[PDB]
Write a protein that binds this ligand. Structure first.
Ligand code: ZN
Lengths: 328, 276, 192
């Protein structure tokens, strides 16, 4: 037997858009101090998942706008970077999550734009790599988070773009995939970052769309779902990262869209709402975004067109004039 | 009186290391309600356990008291810091700030860097995939350098990492973060030493035989062979490739239906074709 | 490549009776060993309870891979392993046990068997002997028998269950599982 999930006959096969909006709106309402403290280290991203999935369904107005904007403002530190929450240390992951939220509400000037760019600059090394924070953790995610943030600020050339691309291309392995560091194992998540990186910096021509697309397509299991790496169970989050990468490299038509669609829909919850990783498990705002964004790429008309690089509504990125060219 | 309970436990945990230095792992037991006059932490032999009713009240307290130290709302003692960061990371190793606080204490000459390697080692037994623990450990290891053969004290440190990477890979199927850190050690701490690279091949030959469907483990195999080529221009490199391609074929004939074994074979084939 | 459980069970007309079992809970974390060992016994009963006399099935869910051989007579046998462990190799070990078990214990002691009454210390040994399939006795007389026998597959534990039976109700109403185990099952599934 091969490692894969089995979609049941009574599994959800229709989009429950209403019960998804009600789930996100009711999430966080429960005064659970434990779950809050346990996930406060990524709250800035937690709101990003929550808001983006609501704006895709055209229900962004149901969220408290002012409270979030006041939260982000008090999250920016003296060094420019934005932490995950109040009291935490600044990081690229939450700096990007902050900007993405401020872009949805078109309130980018709540936070000093200049000091943010200056924070991203100081994280770039001599080779072209980027660190997560001032402690110097090297990863290709941070290379993506860097150029993604600066692209939403209109100041991409602020960093050494020439060397930044030089580092990412050095992380490419034999199978065409990318990893954390030069020599690391290929991972669908890191590919999503590197393909998104080379899209913003306009270097998709130096990517083997056939070989890399081949690696991504081999991640599709008989259930229709996608996984991050060989011999891994299918996951909705992985289903988005692999799908979005294909759309970037221009090889989206290779995978079975109908089977993957039925996989994502099967991960729904007919009682509570939201998306889980696999049919049967507990749902969360994290997978709820990638479940909705996944169906949007497959052409779900009830969901706004989503950008494969920034994971944001296309109408939002059309406003700020940032839409990187994708492979035809 | 609820704040009094928490101060007792963080002492019971701190003194638990006074009880036994080498603690194996930290777990969690389902105690729906508190037992009378019994500390929520229970250690039997090497193992350390925490009752379920404890986590509801302990975690949000220690979490809050660390944010106050970060926002200058409440000053915590030097020893109080290493005690609140200790109990926080045994419940949530993904807390970046909690690690960063320890990063400051270590760099200020307050905290011993080895104590974090012993703390993280316990954090990898309950949270073997938690990246922040691996992220922090990389920072500590690189800090332990600069206060062509690596020092003997470093050789003991490298082999120490090989043990915690193996056990973390044995608690979670194909632990990417565990194998990626194991590779990171060979790149910086070992400097791709041809000696250690060969010894690690034989150590992982048994694991691959007992753990297929683990591309992260088999990628470590690929990384070893690649580094052996970058060093040469001793042991015959094609001879090693001859043995590996047969070792992979043996596992496929034995256990069919694993794409990792097939992906591994292609990766080995590519190394053979690119020597001419 | 590990074997989590290996139990020999009897199935009467009332309920399935435990005869002799061997557990290797060294892979799991320290404080879950007391719980998940009872689940491998709780499942073992349910698996035999549904299995008809003279068949052979295998239910696959998550990390568990319960293999079962309900022979023509009353007794049975359940072995639980990884998704990594071979399917039919688990039956080679399973058939060999049921044969050497009937030569030790008479048919009189079977319907009223018990883990403390049945003398058969070969389970704790063979569970550790047959951990790695590379070291296993090749019985061609039963291996040629396993090939011409297709095995029934079950996608979940609810595949065996009725149309109105929920597994959550069988856990809270089990006399085999403990209160610690009942609280563990509710914590395990509602988390992930
Ligand atoms: Zn997931």
């Amino acid at each position: 037997p091969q490692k894969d999930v089995i979609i049941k006959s009574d599994a959800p096969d229709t989009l429950l858009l209403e019960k998804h909006a009600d789930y996100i709106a009711s999430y966080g309402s429960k005064k659970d101090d434990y779950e809050y403290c346990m996930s406060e280290y990524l709250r800035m991203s937690g709101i990003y998942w929550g808001l983006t999935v609501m704006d895709l369904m055209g229900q962004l107005h149901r969220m408290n706008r002012e409270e979030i904007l006041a939260f982000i403002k008090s999250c920016q530190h003296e060094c420019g970077g934005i932490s995950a929450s109040i009291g935490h240390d600044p990081h690229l992951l939450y700096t990007l999550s902050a900007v993405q939220i401020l872009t949805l509400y078109d309130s980018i000037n709540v936070i000093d734009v200049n000091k943010v760019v200056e924070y991203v600059k100081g994280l770039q090394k001599e080779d072209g790599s980027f660190a997560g924070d001032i402690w110097g953790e090297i990863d290709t995610r941070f290379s993506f988070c860097a150029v993604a943030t600066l692209a939403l600020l209109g100041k991409l050339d602020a960093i050494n773009v020439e060397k930044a691309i030089e580092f990412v291309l050095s992380c490419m392995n034999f199978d065409g995939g990318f990893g954390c560091r030069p020599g690391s194992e290929s991972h669908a998540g890191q590919i999503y970052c590197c393909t998104g990186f080379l899209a913003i910096t306009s270097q998709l021509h130096q990517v083997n769309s056939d070989l890399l697309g081949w690696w991504l397509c081999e991640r599709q299991l008989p259930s229709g779902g996608l996984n991050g790496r060989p011999e891994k169970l299918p996951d909705v989050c992985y289903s988005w990262w692999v799908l979005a990468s294909l759309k970037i490299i221009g090889r989206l038509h290779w995978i079975d869209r109908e089977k993957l669609r039925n996989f994502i829909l099967a991960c729904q919850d007919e009682e509570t709402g939201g998306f889980a990783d696999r049919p049967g498990d507990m749902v969360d705002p994290f997978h709820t975004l990638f479940g909705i964004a996944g169906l949007s790429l497959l052409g779900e008309e009830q969901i706004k067109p989503v950008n494969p690089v920034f994971c944001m509504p296309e109408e939002v990125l059309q406003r700020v004039n940032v839409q990187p060219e994708l492979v035809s | 009186e609820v704040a009094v309970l928490v101060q007792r436990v963080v002492k019971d945990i701190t003194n638990a290391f006074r009880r036994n230095p080498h603690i194996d792992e930290i777990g969690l037991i389902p105690c729906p309600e508190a037992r009378y006059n019994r500390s929520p932490i229970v250690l039997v032999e090497n193992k350390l356990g925490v009752e379920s009713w404890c986590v509801k009240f302990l975690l949000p307290y220690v979490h809050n008291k660390l944010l106050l130290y970060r926002t200058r709302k409440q000053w915590l003692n030097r020893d109080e810091l290493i005690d609140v960061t200790c109990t926080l990371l045994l419940l949530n190793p993904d807390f970046t700030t909690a690690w960063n606080v320890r990063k400051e204490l270590i760099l200020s000459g307050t905290l011993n860097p080895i104590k974090d390697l012993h703390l993280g080692k316990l954090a990898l037994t309950k949270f073997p995939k938690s990246p922040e623990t691996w992220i922090h450990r990389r920072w500590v290891l690189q800090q332990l350098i600069q206060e062509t053969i690596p020092t003997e004290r470093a050789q003991r440190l490298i082999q120490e990492e090989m043990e915690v990477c193996g056990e973390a890979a044995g608690r979670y199927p194909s632990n990417y973060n565990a194998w990626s850190h194991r590779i990171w050690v060979l790149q910086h701490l070992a400097k791709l030493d041809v000696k250690i690279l060969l010894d690690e091949l034989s150590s992982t030959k048994h694991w691959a035989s007992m753990h297929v469907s683990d591309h992260s483990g088999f990628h470590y195999r690929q990384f070893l062979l690649k580094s052996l080529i970058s060093q040469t221009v001793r042991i015959n490199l094609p001879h090693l490739l001859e043995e590996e391609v047969e070792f992979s074929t043996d596992l496929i004939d034995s256990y069919p239906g694993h794409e990792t074994l097939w992906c591994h074979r292609r990766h080995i084939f590519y190394l053979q074709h690119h020597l001419n | 490549m590990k074997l989590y459980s290996l139990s020999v069970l009897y199935k009467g007309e009332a309920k399935v009776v435990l005869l002799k079992a061997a557990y290797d809970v060294s892979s799991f974390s320290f404080f879950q060993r007391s719980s998940v060992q009872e689940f491998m016994t709780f499942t073992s009963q349910l698996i035999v309870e549904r299995s008809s006399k003279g068949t052979r099935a295998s239910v696959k869910e998550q990390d568990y891979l319960c293999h079962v051989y309900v022979r023509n007579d009353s007794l049975a046998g359940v072995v639980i392993a990884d998704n990594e462990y071979p399917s039919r190799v688990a039956f080679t070990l399973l058939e060999k046990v049921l044969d050497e078990f009937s030569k030790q214990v008479d048919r009189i002691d079977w319907p009223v068997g018990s883990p403390a009454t049945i003398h058969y210390p070969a389970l704790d040994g063979h569970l550790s002997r047959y951990q790695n399939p590379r070291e296993a006795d090749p019985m061609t007389k039963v291996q040629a028998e396993l090939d011409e026998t297709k095995i029934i597959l079950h996608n979940t534990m609810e595949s065996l269950l009725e149309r109105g039976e929920k597994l959550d109700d069988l856990v809270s109403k089990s006399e085999v599982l403990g209160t610690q185990s009942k609280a563990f099952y509710k914590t395990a599934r509602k988390q992930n």
